[PDB]
């Protein structure tokens, strides 16, 4: 009487909680752990979906909030849905549109009925209810659709956190009932609770009672402490079902990815690679190369001789160093292609080490290259790794 499972576990680390798996979605199989870039082209500065396809990306994020006349998710009235609008043959994960509404507008109010917004020019009100959030996602046809949740700042403390956690449970059940096409789209729940161990445990116990295809860990991209960050992640994965995906939203730093894979997470997203490129910085196994600095002026090697991305096939560090100072826009595009490929290659290398039963050794190699010697790893990541049985040498 159980719903079909979209995830297949290929290998599990004998020490940590690391998992190598496959997502079987309507638009093809996705290898996990997977970083998911933003396929939405709401930015002049970015990477096209055709280039994401060339990099091997088989699932990306896509949303329509940036379209239309008013803020909030928008219907596109396209025959082929958001896949046709994006020209994307692969998998799409679509947000609810609620986080962007309460975060960017800042004039929105959250009630039990949904997210409300009074127009700036005339005061016309747009209400984003769980019914309306799912009806839009059904029309977009995305492969994975996210629950509309009551998002609170992780730093904000008080009954508001508990209020949002219970409201997210009530909204989750509203999204389930309103969700047509469960044969084509997978609705994920979002675990709330902020930094409170008892609130998240209540949300974990309650939300896992629903038979949604996947579960997401929300409310942790905020500026909390790294100790509270990894503890809430480990708490979540310790009580989420192992036979279903775990989506940790908003984490993109290389060290945060390796640790949270070791904590049992399967899916990630973050605009960190794009923002890193705009500082003239390229992601490497040792951190990031600040290519604007003149040490690369006559450095004609690629960013990374091991990287397979087109930027490292065609352009050198010197060309990018000069391009950052003569055409900053074109250089941002080349670094964006690389930084996104580094994320893809990092996740692919993590998965290979889990399949080959050498994930703990992979983490030591990663920390040594990232921080000099694995013992120089940040204290918070040492605590998180040791809590699942990975010590650094
Ligand atoms: Br399914
Ligand atoms: Cl990205
Ligand atoms: Cl469902
Ligand atoms: Cl210098
Ligand atoms: Cl050159
Ligand atoms: Cl292993
Ligand atoms: K909009
Ligand atoms: Zn590259």
Numbering used by the authors: 11 to 403
Sentences from the paper on this structure:
In contrast to the homodimeric architecture of the bacterial and archeal TGT, the eukaryotic, heterodimeric TGT is composed of a catalytically active queuine tRNA-ribosyltransferase subunit 1 (QTRT1) and a catalytically inactive QTRT2 subunit. Here we report the first crystal structure of the human QTRT1, which is the catalytic subunit of a eukaryotic TGT enzyme. Analysis of the human QTRT1 catalytic subunit reveals the enzyme to possess a bended (α/β) barrel, consisting of an eight stranded β-barrel at the core and eight flanking helices. In addition, the protein contains a Zn2+ binding domain, in which the zinc ion is coordinated by a triangular arrangement of three cysteine residues Cys317, Cys319, and Cys322, while the α-helix bound His248 completes the tetragonal coordination of the metal ion.
Multiple diffraction images datasets of the best diffracting crystal were collected, processed with XDS and subsequently merged with a resolution cutoff at 2.45 Å. The space group was identified to be C2. The crystal’s asymmetric unit comprises two molecules with only one of them (chain A) exhibiting reasonable fit to electron density after initial refinement steps. However, structural analysis of the asymmetric unit’s content revealed both molecules to be the catalytic QTRT1 subunit. Comparison of the human QTRT1 structure with the previously reported structure of its bacterial counterpart from Z. mobilis reveals both proteins to share a fairly similar fold with a root-mean-square deviation (RMSD) of 2.86 Å (calculated between all equivalent Cα positions). Differences between both structures were observed in the conformation of the region comprising amino acids 114–138 which adopts a three stranded beta sheet with an extended loop between the β-strands two and three that folds into a more open conformation compared to the bacterial TGT. In the reported QTRT1 structure we observed conserved Asp105 and Asp279, occupying structurally equivalent positions, thus arguing for a conserved catalytic mechanism. As a consequence of the purification strategy, which included a high salt concentration, we did not observe additional electron density in the active site that may correspond to a bound ligand. Furthermore, we do observe a PGA molecule at the interface of the asymmetric units promoting contact of the B-chain with a symmetry mate through stacking between symmetry equivalent Arg184 residues. Therefore, our crystal structure supports previous observations that QTRT1 is mainly monomeric in solution, and the dimer architecture we observe in the asymmetric unit is likely caused by crystal packing.
